[PDB]
Amino acid sequence: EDGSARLEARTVYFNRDFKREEAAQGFILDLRSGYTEGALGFGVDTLAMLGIQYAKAGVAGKMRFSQTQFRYGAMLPDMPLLKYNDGRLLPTLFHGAQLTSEEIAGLRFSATRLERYTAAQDIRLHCKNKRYACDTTGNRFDAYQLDYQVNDGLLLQYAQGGLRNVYRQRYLGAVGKRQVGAGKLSADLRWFDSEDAGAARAGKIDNRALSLLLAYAQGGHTLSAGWQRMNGASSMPYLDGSNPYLANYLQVNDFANPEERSWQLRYDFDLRSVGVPGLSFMTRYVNGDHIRLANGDEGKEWERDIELKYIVQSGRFKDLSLRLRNATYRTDFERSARDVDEVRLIASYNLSLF
Numbered sequence: 133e134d135g136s137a138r139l140e141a142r143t144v145y146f147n148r149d150f151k152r153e154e155a156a157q158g159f160i161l162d163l164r165s166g167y168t169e170g171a172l173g174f175g176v177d178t179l180a181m182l183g184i185q186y187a188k189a190g191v192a193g194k195m196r197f198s199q200t201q202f203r204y205g206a207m208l209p210d211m212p213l214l215k216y217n218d219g220r221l222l223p224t225l226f227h228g229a230q231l232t233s234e235e236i237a238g239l240r241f242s243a244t245r246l247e248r249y250t251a252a253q254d255i256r257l258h259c260k261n262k263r264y265a266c267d268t269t270g271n272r273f274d275a276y277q278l279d280y281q282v283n284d285g286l287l288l289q290y291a292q293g294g295l296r297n298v299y300r301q302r303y304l305g306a307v308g309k310r311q312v313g314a315g316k317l318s319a320d321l322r323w324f325d326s327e328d329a330g331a332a333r334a335g336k337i338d339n340r341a342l343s344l345l346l347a348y349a350q351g352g353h354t355l356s357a358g359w360q361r362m363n364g365a366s367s368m369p370y371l372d373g374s375n376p377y378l379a380n381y382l383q384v385n386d387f388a389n390p391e392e393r394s395w396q397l398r399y400d401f402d403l404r405s406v407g408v409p410g411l412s413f414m415t416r417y418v419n420g421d422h423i424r425l426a427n428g429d430e431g432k433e434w435e436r437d438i439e440l441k442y443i444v445q446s447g448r449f450k451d452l453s454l455r456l457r458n459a460t461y462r463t464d465f466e467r468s469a470r471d472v473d474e475v476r477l478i479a480s481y482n483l484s485l486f
C-alpha cells in the first residue's frame with residue numbers, strides 16, 4: 133500500500149444469561165506506513181491498544197521488492213489456519229514474521245512463523261470447553277499457504293502448518309461467486325486435516341473438518357445453507373485467540389466437537405432496498421448432533437443468532453456503527469454449564485487519520 137492510519141473507538145456492552153454482564157471502552161490504533169522509495173522499500177507498522185485496564189503496543193518492520201513483502205514484529209494474522217478473533221474488546225496480538233509473494237499474478241504465496249501472542253505469552257491450543265487441555269503450549273506456530281485464483285469466479289487454496297509439539301494441520305479451500313441470473317450464487321468449500329505433532333503436548337489429536345456454505349443473493353436478500361462435519365477422535369484444533377474457519381462458526385459455539393454433524397440456515401437482509409440505507413438484518417440457525425461425548429452417549433446442541441447493524445448516514449456522528457448481536461444456545465449435555473443467552477451491543481467508530 134501507500135499507507136493507512138486508523139484510530140478506532142469501540143464501545144461494547146455484553147450480557148450473558150445462564151446474570152453476568154460487562155461494559156467496555158476500547159481504542160485501537162493501527163498505523164501502516166508507506167514504503168521508502170527505491171527498489172527495496174522500507175516502512176513501519178504499529179499497533180497500540182487501550183481498554184477498560186488493558187494497555188498494549190506493537191511495532192513491525194516491513195520490506196518490499198517487486199510483488200514480495202516481508203514483515204517482522206507485531207501482527208494480526210487473518211488466514212485459514214489462524215483467523216484472528218474480533219469478538220472481544222481489543223484483538224489478539226501475535227508476534228513473528230510474515231513473507232508474502234505474488235510475482236505471478238493470481239498466484240499468492242505466504243509464509244508465517246509466530247513465536248508469541250498477547251490476549252505477552254506463548255501460543256496456546258484453544259481449549260475453552262474441555263477435551264484439549266488448557267495451557268497447552270507450542271514453541272512457535274508455522275503456516276505456509278498457496279492461493280490460486282483460477283478465474284474471476286474461482287479461488288483455490290492450499291495451506292499447511294501447525295503449533296510445534298501440539299499439532300499439524302492441512303487445509304484445502306475453494307471459494308467463488310457466479311451470476312445466475314438476476315442474483316449472485318456463492319459456494320465456499322473448506323477442509324482441514326489435523327493430527328498431533330512432535331511431543332504431542334495435548335496429546336493425541338485426530339480430525340478431519342469439512343464445511344460447505346452455499347449462498348444465493350439477489351437485491352438485498354441472501355439465503356444461505358451450510359453443512360459441516362467432523363471426523364476422527366478429536367475436535368478440530370485451533371489457536372487460542374482465533375476462530376476456527378468453518379461455515380458453522382457462530383456467535384457462541386463452533387459445532388466442531390468430535391464427530392459432530394451440523395446444518396445451517398441463514399438469512400441476510402440489507403434494507404438499502406426498502407430505503408433505509410445503513411440498516412442490515414441477519415438471522416441464522418444451526419442444528420448439530422452426532423457428538424461423541426466422553427460419556428459414550430450422543431450429544432445434541434443448537435444455536436440461533438439474530439443481528440442488527442446500523443450505520444449512521446450523515447451528521448457529526450456519520451459512519452458510527454451500532455451493532456446488536458443475540459445468541460441463544462442449548463445442548464442436551466452439561467446443560468447448566470453451557471446453555472447461554474447472550475446479548476452484545478457494539479458501538480464502533482473508525483477515524484481515518486490520513
Ligand SMILES: CCCCCCCCOCCOCCOCCOCCO
Pocket residue numbers: 415417436438460
Ligand atoms: C423464542 C423466540 C425468540 C425470537 C423469535 C423470533 C422469530 C423470528 O425470527 C427468527 C429467528 O428467531 C428464532 C428464535 O430463536 C429461538 C427459537 O428457535 C427457533 C428456530 O427458528
Ligand SMILES: [Ca+2]
Pocket residue numbers: 134135165166167
Ligand atoms: Ca508514509
Ligand SMILES: [Ca+2]
Pocket residue numbers: 261367386388389
Ligand atoms: Ca470445540
